[PDB]
Amino acid sequence: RPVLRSVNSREPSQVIFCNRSPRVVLPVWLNFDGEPQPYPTLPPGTGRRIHSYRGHLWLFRDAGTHDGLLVNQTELFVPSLNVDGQPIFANITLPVYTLKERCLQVVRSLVKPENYRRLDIVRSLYEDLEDHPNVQKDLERLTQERIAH
Amino acid sequence: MYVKLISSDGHEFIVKREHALTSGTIKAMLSGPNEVNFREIPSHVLSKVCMYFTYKVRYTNSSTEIPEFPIAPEIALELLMAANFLDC
Amino acid sequence: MDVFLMIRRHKTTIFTDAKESSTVFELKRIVEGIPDEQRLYKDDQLLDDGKTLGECGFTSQTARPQAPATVAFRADDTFEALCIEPFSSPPELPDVMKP
């Protein structure tokens, strides 16, 4: 009943996820309730043909930081049907982040959770750090994204 | 058209204006209907910030694979400080 | 396709780009916008004019934008030595930020 769920299309759609990003990629699938689900991770560079369904809803994150990744130059992925039996192609890449979270990501990995507070930084930054990107959030951000459009 | 973004120690980075427009700060410093000096941003921090520009112009709206941004763990606490201020 | 460049002289660094097939005399007009008094150098090697970027050893593989490759003023009559002032050094990395 939210406006980002997989349609119960009951139609097969053989789909290829290959990760062209340095990250370990986590396929996330928004089901029939719109609740994201974790699938087996893709090592960087490689990819697999998957049995998905027409009009299912896939998005992709770095399995580590949960950083937002792109797919076919977009946040979300929905296939359609395989024309003449040929398969759909999901090209998972890095987005041009802002140098802000780009750097956030780095500080975030090198510094353990508790000791963000030791870093010699201005005060708004401990919150910039402490709010590491989230999928449940990036679902709410996007629903009103498309509700405005 | 070009700008001259100078650092604290006195490094003068002449970059493309549209590249500089990537900053939200530097967009509201050139907005009056050139040069900008930064007093608390070093050179080793600003050259790397002029890099996000050449690369943000290059790779935003690109259908290819898009390369990772390189951050040496040492310039890592000073670019976050630069960027949070820069707004890019 | 093309290279990515940092053209350095003293405390001047210029963020530009040029095609790998295009020459040096072209890059010396590009600088004549920011010729008779101008010498470019790969590291310590004086580049000559009728040579291209690929001929001077800037593959677009060694001149990516997120780390561009680095490319002398003739005052009066003679040239200066190629002078480039390095950037400052960051503080040593904090006690917890280290492994």
What is the number of other CB atoms lying within 10 angstroms of the CB of residue C71? 24
Which CATH number is A16's domain given? Answer: 2.60.40.780
Radius of gyration of chain C (CA): 16
Q: What single string gives the DSSP state of each residue in chain C?
A: -B--EEEEEBTEEEEE--BTTSBSTTHHHHGGG---S---EETTEEP-TT-BTTTTT--TTS--TTS-EE---EETTEEPP--B-PPP-PPPPPTTT--
Q: How far away is chain C from the Cα of B15, in angstroms, using its nearest Cα?
A: 5
Residue B36 falls within a domain, yes or no?
Answer: yes
Q: Report CB contact under 8 Å: B84, A128.
A: yes
- For residues C93 and B69, give the distance between their C-alpha atoms in angstroms, rounded to a whole number: 19
Which CATH number is B69's domain given? Answer: 3.30.710.10
State which residues form the domain around A134.
94-145
Query: Do the beta carbons of residue C55 and residue C19 sit within 8 Å?
Result: no
Cα dihedral angle (C82, C87, C88, C90), rounded to 10 degrees? -140
Q: C1-96 maps to which CATH number? A: 3.10.20.90
Helix H, strand E, coil C: the string for chain B is: CECCEECCCCCEEECEHHHHCCCCCCCCCCCCCCCEECCCCCHHHHCCCCHHHHHHHHHCCCCCCCCCCCCCCCCHHHHHHHHHHHCC
Give me the resolution in angstroms, 1 decimal: 3.2
- For residues A90 and B37, give the distance between their C-alpha atoms in angstroms, rounded to a whole number: 45
Q: Report CB contact under 8 Å: C88, B13.
A: no
Please tell me if residue B21 touches chain C, with a CB cutoff of 8 Å.
Answer: no
Query: Do the beta carbons of residue B17 and residue B2 sit within 8 Å?
Result: yes
Q: How many domains does chain A divide into?
A: 2
| Pair (A53, A29) in one structural domain | yes
- Select from A7, A13, A8 the least CA-distant residue to A88: A13
Q: How was this structure determined?
A: X-ray
Q: How far away is chain A from the Cα of C66, in angstroms, using its nearest Cα?
A: 12
Nearest to B83 among A70, A99, A110 (CB): A99
| Numbered residues of chain C with Cβ closer than 8 Å to any chain A Cβ | 94-99
| Pair (A60, A100) in one structural domain | no
Residue B34 falls within a domain, yes or no?
Answer: yes
| Pair (A16, A36) in one structural domain | yes
Residue B67 falls within a domain, yes or no?
Answer: yes
